[PDB]
């Protein structure tokens, strides 16, 4: 339905500390994408649960992270869109 | 760069109270899209500033709302993408 420029998105995220760290949390010590529950993310970055959780929620809405039911809770991984956004940043650095 | 299905997004937002209300806040009494600062939104919906603000920020990242500098602060309006998402909901109702 709608075409998306991945460079603008990455540009926007880069200008917003919380979005940026929420995104990068899913990338591990060896550069590999990983699974995380909401609590892990909030613990990993130094921002409050409300901030981090709301960001996680919106990023799943945006389709940047995936949600999958696991136990009676949920886990988050970067979507293919998520991984592509992360790539723009890696190239900068 | 990336194609987007507007129905899935709307589906995701509809399953998340905060995202949904943050989005609809921009639609006024007469059905018209309107401008809002971050404070207006948080005051309008009954959720905490941290939740609402983080959601606003991520929605601008996603390209659902636009940011424009005004005074030395910012204001938010739905993008064309934002308006299209709102339309799916209007059709449901």
State which residue of chain A sits closest to B1, comparing Cα positions: A5
Record the tokens describing residue A85, joined without a space. Answer: 């956004």
Contact partners, residue A35, CB within 8 Å, separation at least 6:
A75, A76, A77
Method: X-ray
Query: How large is the C-alpha radius of gyration of chain B?
Result: 13
Instruction: Give the CATH number for residue A18.
Output: 1.10.10.10
Q: Which of A52, A61, A68, A54 has its CA nearest to residue A82?
A: A61
Cβ distance B48 to A51 less than 8 Å, yes or no, reads: no
CB contacts < 8 A, A to B, total 93
Decide if A56 contacts A79 (C-beta within 8 A).
no
Report how far residue A57's alpha carbon sits from residue B52's, in angstroms, rounded to the nearest whole number.
12
| Of residues B2, B18, B50, nearest to A51 (C-beta) | B50
Contact partners, residue B71, CB within 8 Å, separation at least 6:
none
Phi, psi of B31 (to 5 degrees): 90, 0
CA distances from B37 to A31, A65, B52, B67, B82 (A): 38, 27, 11, 9, 16
Report how far residue B69's alpha carbon sits from residue B75's, in angstroms, rounded to the nearest whole number.
6
Decide if B89 contacts B10 (C-beta within 8 A).
yes
Decide if B85 contacts B9 (C-beta within 8 A).
yes
| Of residues B1, B3, B59, nearest to A58 (C-beta) | B59
Decide if A73 contacts A37 (C-beta within 8 A).
yes
Please identify which residue in the block is written with the tokens 């404070």: B39
Report how far residue A4's alpha carbon sits from residue B2's, in angstroms, rounded to the nearest whole number.
5
Residues of B in contact with A55 (CB under 8 A): 54-55, 57-58
Which residues form the domain of A38? Answer: 1-93
Report how far residue A80's alpha carbon sits from residue A23's, in angstroms, rounded to the nearest whole number.
13
Residues of A in contact with B53 (CB under 8 A): 51
Cβ distance A55 to B58 less than 8 Å, yes or no, reads: yes
Name the domain count of chain B. 1
Q: Which of A48, A71, A74 has its CA nearest to residue A60?
A: A74
Instruction: Choose the mutation target among A3, A23, A54, A83 for the interface with B, i.e. most B CBs under 10 Å.
Output: A54
Q: How far is A5 from chain B (nearest CA, A)?
A: 5
b/e sequence B40-50, b meaning 16+ C-beta within 10 Å: bbbeebebeeb
């Amino acid at each position: 339905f709608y075409t998306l420029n991945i460079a603008e998105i990455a540009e926007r995220i880069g200008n917003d500390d919380c979005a940026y760290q929420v995104l990068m949390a899913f990338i591990n010590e060896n550069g590999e994408a990983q699974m995380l529950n909401k609590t892990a993310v909030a613990e990993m970055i130094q921002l409050s649960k409300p901030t981090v959780f709301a960001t996680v929620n919106s990023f799943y809405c945006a389709g940047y992270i995936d949600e999958t039911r696991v136990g009676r809770s949920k886990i988050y991984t970067l979507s293919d869109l998520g991984v592509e956004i992360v790539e723009c940043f890696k190239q900068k650095a």
